[PDB]
Design an enzyme around this catalytic site. Structure first.
Site, mmCIF file in Angstrom:
data_model
loop_
_atom_site.group_PDB
_atom_site.id
_atom_site.type_symbol
_atom_site.label_atom_id
_atom_site.label_comp_id
_atom_site.label_asym_id
_atom_site.label_seq_id
_atom_site.Cartn_x
_atom_site.Cartn_y
_atom_site.Cartn_z
ATOM 1 N N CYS A 46 4.395 -17.068 -44.078
ATOM 2 C CA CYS A 46 2.959 -17.639 -44.098
ATOM 3 C C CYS A 46 2.822 -17.959 -42.617
ATOM 4 C CB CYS A 46 2.745 -19.004 -44.908
ATOM 5 S SG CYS A 46 1.307 -19.481 -46.021
ATOM 6 N N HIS B 103 24.375 22.297 -31.818
ATOM 7 C CA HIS B 103 25.829 22.239 -31.626
ATOM 8 C C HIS B 103 26.229 20.790 -31.312
ATOM 9 C CE1 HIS B 103 29.911 22.960 -30.765
ATOM 10 N NE2 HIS B 103 29.823 23.227 -29.474
ATOM 11 N N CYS C 82 1.059 -22.048 -49.851
ATOM 12 C CA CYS C 82 -0.340 -22.133 -49.399
ATOM 13 C C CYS C 82 -1.252 -21.916 -50.687
ATOM 14 C CB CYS C 82 -0.624 -21.213 -48.123
ATOM 15 S SG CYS C 82 0.185 -21.531 -46.458
ATOM 16 N N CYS D 112 1.486 -21.907 -44.073
ATOM 17 C CA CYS D 112 2.738 -22.545 -44.587
ATOM 18 C C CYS D 112 3.724 -22.737 -43.396
ATOM 19 C CB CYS D 112 3.423 -21.710 -45.767
ATOM 20 S SG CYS D 112 2.342 -21.133 -47.135
ATOM 21 N N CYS E 190 30.580 22.093 -36.568
ATOM 22 C CA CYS E 190 30.562 21.144 -35.453
ATOM 23 C C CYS E 190 30.084 19.758 -35.911
ATOM 24 C CB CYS E 190 29.734 21.669 -34.283
ATOM 25 S SG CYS E 190 28.014 22.078 -34.706
#
Lengths: 407, 302, 515
Positions: free
Chosen positions: B118, B249, B168, B121, B12
């Protein structure tokens, strides 16, 4: 021998600027056995209120459905609910089951109350559950429409006209006093438009389907009359909100969901805006006058089931409140203030379905899980909010300051 | 007057996925235009010609993939994931006789970015990832559209586990987030219902109600994303009955023109779209039948 | 888990060695205060009469100084740092008086309410404390305890923080997107203002605490009614995240800068007449208006560069606006360049650095010195040119967060590096040439002035580090624990601190001589 037992909750209060709203479970309503309904997926528990002229002071009455059953009690608000074991009327529909319903507010008194009830076959019944006496059984023969009815409402101001709406994406106008056909009655066109049709009943006598209103593709999920009565708001599975001039039978304006198809609708209490829940988990806010989207609201983890403005917390500055409830089991409350409504004051098609970046996106004031089952009922009242879920518990939340009275 | 397949043991998984694949309109075209492709073309030709037993497929598959050989049950996503790029590195090989995008990648392929930021940043770095399936985790009383937002949740690098920012030049907070950038021609959505809840040192099925619409846009989109409002239409879904990973199934649900169609084992049945709401999931959760969705196939409108 | 860090710098370092985070102003003495990513708070002089604006340096903190507040008429200054501390300074005499250690993560912002001499510290630990400035400045060593007072609410790290002049509204801004508001007296939560879709680095309150201006990384500025607990307006003058805001004395005009680099004056009542004041060289981190005249004359601006500009707003009334008002500064404070790169060399002694000018340079870690500037030379080629066939193991770690060289010595690898005196560069008439331990040879040159490491000696013999070099005893990922200069080791209070703070493992090879 023995074995050993190896081994998330709903909220019962929220606060908002107004104060603390509190669920009051001593005012709860449900089947009298209190056993949670086994939500089957089948069809929604719904609630309907009416006042009988407040002849005692205890004039408010409640009606709800739970698959095969249908009850009718005295609704005592934030006071101890009426004894659940002793209804005023019960009903057992061993055939096809209820689906929606509505009281007539106008012909309503201590001795009679007209209530009409939709079913999953297409039928619509007309009970008077204080005297039990009458009935009607419109579309009993299933000849007008065989699909399940989704929304039924008495026409505002009428005694005898009412409107029903079906999974077929059709609606039908009925007089109480007329009588239905012996066979599937014929129509001829009245109005034609982009994505809707209205036909009218070709008959030499007074036969019920006064008319048939065809609205878009897929099921008509919910309609709603303007507070004034003049207009009708329709949401359909193709995702169009189609708002119509009811008397004129012409199309005032449309709106399309970002995606998914629209499931509920309502009117601001002054009929100036429409809000709309759907299958994108969003609520949308629409200006009637400007025919334009003005805010979306993303707060819900599932599909939105019911939306409703709160007349009692609405308004020198203009402010509306509305609420939604969802298939996520959560209640969200929202605020429309002047910054969202009037941004420009001093201190297929995408342009009637704006870009997400262009329309504002609101955040709920609150967003609480308040049931185990998916919710199906949101109703704003003078003293309390009323909620309900598929497992058939009708909950009453005391408004801040409305829990207790002194004189 | 209908089609169908045949259930040898626990085929199945093959049955359902195969039907689902056949009803993907741009796949069905290119599957028969021209190994495991050789039996897929032998069976996709055999259905367009006319209950077909897909023999050639089963033991053919049960040889050159030993994980499938068992007679025990089979996770239909494993098959889908396998089948699809077994084909793509054959269409790569037939290109190498005569790193270039194959005709399976034109259809089921999409990309998603892993953004890192960041919080100081506010600078932002991408690392892309191509995908065929999108495997989305699943919670109670929810929508795929919610679950998709969860995929694109924000992990927060902070405290003792902060991020070194190149710019940074120091340890800062940061947000990492996954977002869909290139959207596919066919979005296949796997619902992670089979989850190794290691209390028992076992797997379990999640019969949670996760609703899915027939029309679909994604909110997850990159911002540099190329075609971000692809409207989708539900083509087909793989439901799945039972109560565990290995007692299941699988069943298919399918759109061709107006009609919607069920495929149980052999036995086809026309059912209206109204009837897809049975396959969302359970609320009360008896862990019972949970007839429930599992692999969702969405196709582009354009 | 006690480390030993030290810094390779000139004795003064009179310029910012890294980008400035925050600006105060003291209009009585016409002084600026900068607070530097390079750990150092400097005092300047805004008289354009003077050529040399520099006045002092105020030196304690270990990491970035993220924010400052000047209060008690310039007498007192309060500082908040990535080193997790909040420090109380005497800003007249330029020296730190107290360290408050109540935060647990970077202290990210400071708020001030003049009328009650009240400040609030807030940051990444999601918490917010309230400090009466007057009790802080009477902290002795005997009545040294302060009583702590916080605000519940924040669900994510706090990046910005404002109080009104009266000391009756306080607003946190945060990565939670949502502004939270409190009354500082009672500590009662007053409201949450949902609205922004991103972090919020900038917050302002009018004097009465009835309106609020908020600048956010969603690229919008918002004006709020605290009476109507909602947003009144939303201005989108920038392309990129708004990280700083100032306002005029009547709360009608908002000056706004950020990542965008462009700085605008915007009239809240009329957005469409914005004056683009300038496009700065770098991303703007903070601003401070000159408040000695109504139409504010000037705005000082801080960026990620070490250079601090003023800009005059002379022609504002008659000046999408593409055309600047200023194209060059009025004043400038000059900025020192920042070390952006480091190569340890194979000998684990010579470091080779690049700075923000692309000036490459050669440093002796052991002796803790510069050796030679090598100008705008290629760096990875110079790595090669200074190759030495040898292998020494790792014994220190470098970091560049201040922009100055900061060497750190952990217990684990500090000593795992023996090198023989001759090729190490230390002669003798003996030709003794023992295997010396570089890390241990370093520890005692650092504590060379400390009596407990002093019979018929002072140091480890072979070398002295510069006497100004600052030594820092920190904790693993933890609190800076004690700090001094190399030469100061012999002081009376300082030998007492060195007893209770210097860990056993450094006692071992500076006092005892065991390794």
């Amino acid at each position: 021998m023995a074995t050993e037992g190896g081994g998330n909750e709903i909220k019962t209060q929220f606060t908002t600027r107004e104060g603390l709203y509190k669920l009051l479970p001593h005012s709860e309503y449900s089947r009298p056995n209190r056993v949670p309904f086994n939500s089957q997926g089948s069809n929604p528990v719904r609630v309907s209120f009416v006042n009988l002229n407040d002849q005692s002071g205890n004039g408010d009455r409640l009606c709800f459905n739970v698959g095969r059953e249908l009850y009718f009690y005295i609704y005592k608000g934030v006071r101890k609910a009426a004894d659940l074991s002793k209804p005023i009327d019960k009903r057992i529909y061993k055939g096809t089951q209820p689906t929606c319903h509505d009281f007539n507010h106008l012909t309503a008194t201590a001795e009679s109350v007209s209530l009409l009830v939709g079913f999953s076959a297409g039928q619509v019944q007309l009970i008077d559950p204080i005297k039990k006496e009458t009935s009607k059984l419109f579309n009993e023969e299933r000849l007008i429409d065989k699909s399940r009815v989704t929304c039924v409402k008495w026409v505002p101001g009428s005694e005898s006209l009412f409107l029903v709406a079906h999974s077929s994406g059709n609606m039908y106008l009925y007089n109480v006093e007329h009588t239905c056909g012996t066979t599937a009655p014929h129509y001829q066109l009245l109005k034609q438009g982009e994505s809707f049709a209205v036909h009218t009943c070709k008959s030499k006598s007074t036969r019920n389907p006064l008319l048939k209103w065809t609205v878009g593709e897929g099921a008509l999920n919910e309609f709603a009359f303007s507070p004034d009565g003049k207009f009708l708001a329709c949401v359909s599975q193709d995702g169009f909100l189609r708002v119509f001039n009811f008397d004129s039978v012409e199309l005032h304006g449309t709106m399309k969901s970002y995606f998914g198809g629209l499931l509920c609708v309502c009117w601001s209490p002054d009929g100036k805006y429409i809000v709309t829940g759907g299958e994108d988990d969003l609520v949308t806010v629409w200006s009637f006058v400007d025919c334009r989207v003005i805010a979306r609201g993303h707060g819900h983890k599932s599909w939105v089931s019911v939306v409703a403005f709160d007349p009692y917390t609405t308004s020198v500055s203009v402010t509306y409140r509305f609420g939604s409830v969802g298939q996520d089991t959560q209640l969200c409350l929202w605020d429309l203030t002047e910054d969202i409504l009037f941004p420009h004051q001093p201190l297929l098609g995408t342009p009637l379905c704006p870009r997400m970046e262009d329309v504002p996106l609101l955040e709920p004031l609150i967003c609480k899980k308040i049931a185990h089952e998916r919710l199906t009922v949101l109703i704003f009242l003078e003293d309390c909010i009323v909620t309900a879920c598929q497992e058939g518990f009708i909950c009453t939340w005391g408004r801040p300051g409305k829990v207790v009275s002194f004189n | 007057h209908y089609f169908g397949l045949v259930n040898f043991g626990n085929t199945c998984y093959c049955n359902s996925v195969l039907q689902a694949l056949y009803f993907c309109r741009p796949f069905r075209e290119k599957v028969l235009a021209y190994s495991l492709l050789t039996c897929l073309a032998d069976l996709f030709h055999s259905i367009a010609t006319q209950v077909i037993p897909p023999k050639k497929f089963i033991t053919r598959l049960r040889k050159e993939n030993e994980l499938f050989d068992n007679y025990m049950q089979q996770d239909a996503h494993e098959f889908l994931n396998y089948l699809l790029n077994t084909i793509a590195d054959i269409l790569q090989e037939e290109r190498k006789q005569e790193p270039d995008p194959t005709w399976v990648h034109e259809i089921f392929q999409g990309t998603l970015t892993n953004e890192t930021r960041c919080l100081t940043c506010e600078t932002i770095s991408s690392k892309d990832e191509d995908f065929l399936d999108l495997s989305v985790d699943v919670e109670q009383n929810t929508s795929i559209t919610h679950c998709l937002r969860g995929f694109s949740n924000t992990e927060t690098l902070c405290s003792e586990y902060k991020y070194y920012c190149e710019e940074c030049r120091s340890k800062q907070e940061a947000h990492k987030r996954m977002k869909v950038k290139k959207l596919p021609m066919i979005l296949a959505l796997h619902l992670k219902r089979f989850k190794y809840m290691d209390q028992l040192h076992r797997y379990t099925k999640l019969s949670y109600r996760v609703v899915f619409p027939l029309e679909l846009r994604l909110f997850n989109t990159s911002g540099d994303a190329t075609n971000p409002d692809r409207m989708y239409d539900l083509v087909a879904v793989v439901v799945h009955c039972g109560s565990g990973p290995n007692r299941g199934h699988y069943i298919a649900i399918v759109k061709s023109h107006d009609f919607w169609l069920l495929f149980d084992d052999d036995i086809v049945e026309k059912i209206d779209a109204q009837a897809i709401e049975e396959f969302y999931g359970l609320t009360s959760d008896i862990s019972k039948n949970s007839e429930s969705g599992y692999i969702l196939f969405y196709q582009s409108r354009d | 888990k006690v480390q030993v860090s030290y810094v390779i710098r000139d004795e003064v370092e009179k310029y910012n060695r890294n980008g400035v985070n925050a600006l105060q102003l003291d209009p009585a003495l016409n002084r600026l205060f900068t607070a530097g990513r390079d750990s150092i708070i400097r005092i300047w002089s805004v008289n354009q009469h003077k050529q040399d604006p520099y006045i002092a340096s105020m030196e304690h903190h270990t990491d970035w100084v993220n924010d400052i507040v000047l209060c008690c008429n310039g007498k007192t200054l309060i500082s908040a740092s990535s080193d997790t501390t909040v420090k109380v300074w005497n800003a007249h005499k330029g020296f730190c008086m107290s360290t408050l250690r109540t935060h647990k993560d970077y202290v990210k912002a400071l708020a001030y309410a003049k009328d009650k001499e009240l400040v609030a510290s807030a940051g990444l630990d999601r918490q917010i404390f309230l400090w009466d400035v007057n009790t802080l400045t009477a902290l002795t060593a005997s009545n040294n305890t302060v009583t702590t007072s916080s605000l519940s609410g924040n669900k994510d790290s706090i990046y910005s923080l404002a109080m009104n002049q009266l000391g009756t509204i306080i607003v946190s801004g945060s990565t939670e997107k949502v502004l939270r508001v409190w009354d500082p007296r009672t500590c009662a939560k007053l409201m949450k203002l949902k609205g922004h879709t991103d972090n919020v680095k900038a917050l302002l309150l009018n004097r009465d605490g009835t309106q609020c201006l908020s600048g956010s990384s969603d690229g919008t500025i918002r004006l709020w009614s605290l009476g109507q607990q909602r947003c009144i307006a939303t201005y989108r003058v920038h392309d990129e995240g708004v990280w700083a805001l100032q306002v005029n004395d009547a709360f009608t005009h908002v000056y706004s800068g950020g990542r965008d680099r462009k700085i605008y004056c915007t009239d809240l009542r009329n957005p469409d007449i914005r004056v683009l004041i300038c496009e700065e060289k770098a991303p703007v981190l903070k601003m401070e208006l000159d408040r000695s005249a109504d139409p504010p004359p000037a705005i000082w601006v801080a960026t990620t560069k070490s250079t601090v500009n003023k800009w005059t707003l002379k022609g504002i009334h008659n000046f999408n606006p593409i055309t600047p008002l200023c194209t060059q500064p009025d004043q400038v404070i000059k900025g020192g360049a920042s070390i952006i790169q480091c190569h340890i060399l194979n000998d684990k002694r010579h470091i080779l650095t690049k700075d923000t000018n692309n000036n490459v340079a050669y440093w002796d870690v052991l002796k803790a010195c510069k050796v030679e500037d090598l100008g705008k030379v290629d760096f990875e080629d110079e790595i090669k040119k200074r190759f030495k066939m040898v292998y020494v193991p790792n014994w220190f770690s470098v970091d560049l967060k201040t922009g100055m060289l900061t060497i750190t010595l952990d217990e684990s690898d500090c000593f795992a590096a023996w090198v023989s005196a001759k090729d190490a560069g230390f002669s003798s008439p003996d030709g003794s040439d023992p295997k010396l331990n570089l890390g241990g040879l370093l520890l005692q040159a650092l504590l060379e002035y400390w009596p407990r490491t002093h019979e018929n000696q002072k140091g480890n013999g072979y070398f002295q580090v510069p006497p100004h070099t600052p030594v820092i005893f920190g904790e693993a990922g933890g609190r800076t624990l004690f700090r001094l200069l190399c030469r100061d080791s012999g002081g009376e209070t300082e030998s007492m601190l060195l007893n209770e703070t210097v860990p056993q493992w450094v006692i071992d090879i500076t006092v005892d001589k065991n390794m």
